[PDB]
Symmetry: D2
Subunit: 288 residues, 4 copies
């Protein structure tokens, strides 16, 4: 295998060939149970849909209340590569008005942007009255992919970790409600999903040069993740941390978290349910 | 009862009360067959999803070919209110990369924009290399909703009809491939969809005072549609015109049309299928 | 007089008619010496031109140093209406490259802009590598003209005073050198300059309804000045405060200040000269 | 002595060393009379200022009329390097309100801009109601500096020549008044000004590597000028062509031309005077 990589999965030497259509047993058997996942089987499709429908009905109410009051929301999505960021975003926006809820998904910075204040091109996307803005990756590029891949210098990395709390304090002081979600998955789950994307012609667009590099960089991402959650989890900018091995439970609890934190007119606490504390936690210390 | 309207439906007076949860039989019985619709029943869902999957797999190939060549695509979506243009956009973008495929859904112009060249704020959204940009409504606001609702003057309307072909001639000469889709529905189908949206807590966001006002302005929108298709169907900017009573057949044939017109790498004509000529036609005079 | 205003000049009732082409003696004879001005006559024109020329030669060096190193500079100009903000900006940019030094002169916020984070439209103007950005009025609109005329609420005013220091902390931590200049003049000098502009067909455009109304708001503007200087003079964003009764001395010492604070290659200490401490001071308490 | 270039001056080899402080007599003696210049001596300095003052008083009237009517103006400035475009722009804007009259001086395109429609980044600077926008260079980069220096391909060059008339047809049809000014100078005048800029510490910022390369490329620019004037001078976008050897006469007739073409309230034709038809002509053929 040309793209096959060697990996150290706790003392054990493993080879992963993403192009091999056959998934080996040590990934197949451990993918769902990795990352101390609390559930034995994934949430059934029809129970997920019944619950998600009820949650999206509540988000329609949220949007109506935001147009009426002018309230603005920003929701940041980050995590392990292949953890399910885009799916949590689509589950949130599926039944929202595209003229008042929009997704930010920026590309690599231009020469002009690289010479700007790092946050400038993100401020350009900030919401006006009533808008719900969701970030498919965010300024937290500089706390993960950029230092791991050397797209920013160590000093730029250290600088970003000191400025992000200041940036988000202004956001919160302005009255924009800022959500930050870190969607985690276990190591073998990431391998399984890279394999799934590689061998599905409908999903192979999800598999980028970055992800193939992320394979040998698991521990470095772990370090950057831990460092980032500990140093940028502040009162003004709290991190909600998700065990995301089950995409369905991930999406449901992301949305439950936002509904509970918003004091929107018409809110039906029965339809929201409870955030599963086994799936969604706060700040550092949630992931072992 | 507070918003019931009296309508003239092909010679007879009819009452439509959108807030009445019961749909009148004269709407429910005629909605699907309205607008000379060529089929007796809905396309089967399972068949539709199987076909949509093959089309989205081709759209992955399209996006790969656009990235490698730099080719750019713009897809304009217009039509009768409630004809499902957002549904056609989601079916196109569901498995495309949000960093290279994006949706434009502008809100009403600010005072600054109203004093600008009408087209300026649309040029601001134009694609860079490899981008696929989809317009959920477009500069064709000024050929429909604006003149019907008096948001632009008649001089401004007549000016737009003359200037849009010149605008699209420059788009086409730049080598951006411009698709324009008009999705039609029959009058009874519009009422049924308005009613369904009003009484579904998940879809009530899809209604707006613009829609509410469109109830009493059917014949006005008809003439604005005819005038616009006549005056702005050109070689450089041709209109693809859709009988959209069946949302599944609408979405499939929209995507098939684009796949047929794009000469992309890896194109599988057997997977694409044939554009259904009973559903998708060209220019003025296809619809009655 | 159609728009004559009655004023109280230290317990004495005075009447100022700006449309009267005759300036009264009490304005003409006290204009230059108001605000405890330290010099008895205005600076000799030839000496001013010789000095400004040397100073603009140093600014040429500054611009070359900024292109090579990438250093970015922002210069904010606020003051009494008619104090000479544009003249200080023109003296600074007269021999600078328009592609790397630019002036920001925003108009009143659009509806979209009013629903945004107040600072958003100002971040959009921030410099990329090498750029010198000057603000002909700035975000400090909300600490002066906006509360005085009621274009913002008391709550928005108090919020700005808390947030402007945090905003400029981020600017300073980014390594953009931010200058802030308050150009003060005496009351009678303001009256004289309004009069001069009213009766000069070349300068009448400088007279706006905001200035006509400022005629009666002298004391209100005084309090806003004092409050804003004390609460937004910080280590990260220091205020330079200028006695501006003499436009020539105002322009020279503004530029001297910036030349002294920038550590640019080729700095000719002898060319810069001494900042006149009788003209330019730091922070509150300089004016009285 | 480093970057001396050999030039062919109508049958003779000449050496020009821009770094030599002494200017050769063959340049000095021919500079003002070059380009079939029709006057023996430059315009009297005090007479120029008196005329310019009266023209700028007329431009105040223009601005007030544009504010009241919403009328918009765009003024494009191109010409030989060192012809004085920036000087003509400052003479127009010196006594205009910088909140409604603004200068566009774009830098080289980003990667993103290079993948866009060439005109898109210029459309982003178009005027809203009442604005007067001046271009210090324009989209005509692609008919001059870009093809001469190889920053665009021949296909892109030919495409621009065909598309610029279509672009300006839409500008004119929109009711924006578009002026295009080509400021020409003689070859020895250009060498003289280059030499003057190089050896004046106040103006050396006016030189660029682009200017240095222009030295050896005079004949290329001559053809590029003539092609552009022939192919893009149209009814909707006419070129005003200036003999600019005397910068005072260039500035005055540029402004006179605009005042003549604008039907503004309070127009005083005696103040405007007559455009000097020996200095300012129309389209190709005016220049040798
Ligand atoms: N050369 C680069 N410099 C800075 N950021 C980059 C660079 N290349 C990729 N990125 C960013 O890293 C993140 C991951 O990139 P990629 O995997 O290629 O696409 P996606 O995130 O959509 O899956 C993106 O936000 C991307 O813009
Ligand atoms: N006052 C207005 N002036 C101009 N355009 C308007 C105005 N109000 C609404 N519109 C436009 O009419 C179109 C239909 O409005 P709406 O139904 O709310 O959007 P949507 O397509 O998402 O349902 C939108 O493009 C909207 O911007
Ligand atoms: N209605 C308003 N709301 C907010 N700001 C305003 C409003 N009107 C004027 N301003 C601002 O007050 C400042 C003074 O403007 P003005 O005196 O009218 O003209 P200028 O600043 O060009 O001399 C400007 O920055 C202006 O944008
Ligand atoms: N590498 C480049 N590519 C395209 N345009 C450029 C490039 N370099 C300079 N220019 C443009 O050429 C013109 C001359 O530059 P300057 O003399 O520096 O004003 C300006 O419009 C520049 O933006």
């Amino acid at each position: 295998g040309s793209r096959a990589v060697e990996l150290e999965i706790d003392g054990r030497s493993r080879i992963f060939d993403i192009d091999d259509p056959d998934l080996p047993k040590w990934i197949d058997e451990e993918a769902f149970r990795s990352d101390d996942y609390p559930y034995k089987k994934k949430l059934d499709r029809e129970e997920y849909e019944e619950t998600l429908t009820k949650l999206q009905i509540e988000l329609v109410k949220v949007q109506f209340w935001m147009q009426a009051t002018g309230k603005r929301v920003m929701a940041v999505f980050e995590g392990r590569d292949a953890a399910g960021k885009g799916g949590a975003i689509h589950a949130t926006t599926a039944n929202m008005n595209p003229r008042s809820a929009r997704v930010v998904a920026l590309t690599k910075p231009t020469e002009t942007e690289r010479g700007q204040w790092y946050f400038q091109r993100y401020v350009a996307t900030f919401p006006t009255a009533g808008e719900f803005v969701l970030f498919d990756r965010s300024w937290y590029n500089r706390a993960g992919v950029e230092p791991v891949m050397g797209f920013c210098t160590p000093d730029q990395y250290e600088q970003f970790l000191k400025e992000a709390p200041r940036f988000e304090e202004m956001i919160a002081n302005e009255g924009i409600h800022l959500f930050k979600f870190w969607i985690n998955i276990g190591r073998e789950m990431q391998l399984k999903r890279f394999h799934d994307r590689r061998h599905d012609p409908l999903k192979i667009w999800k598999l980028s040069p970055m992800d193939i590099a992320a394979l040998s960089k698991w521990d470095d991402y772990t370090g950057k993740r831990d460092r980032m959650l500990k140093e940028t989890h502040t009162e003004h900018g709290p991190w909600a941390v998700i065990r995301g091995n089950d995409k369905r439970r991930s999406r449901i609890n992301v949305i439950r978290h936002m509904l509970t934190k918003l004091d929107y007119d018409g809110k039906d606490e029965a339809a929201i349910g409870e955030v599963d504390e086994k799936i969604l936690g706060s700040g550092p210390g949630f992931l072992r």
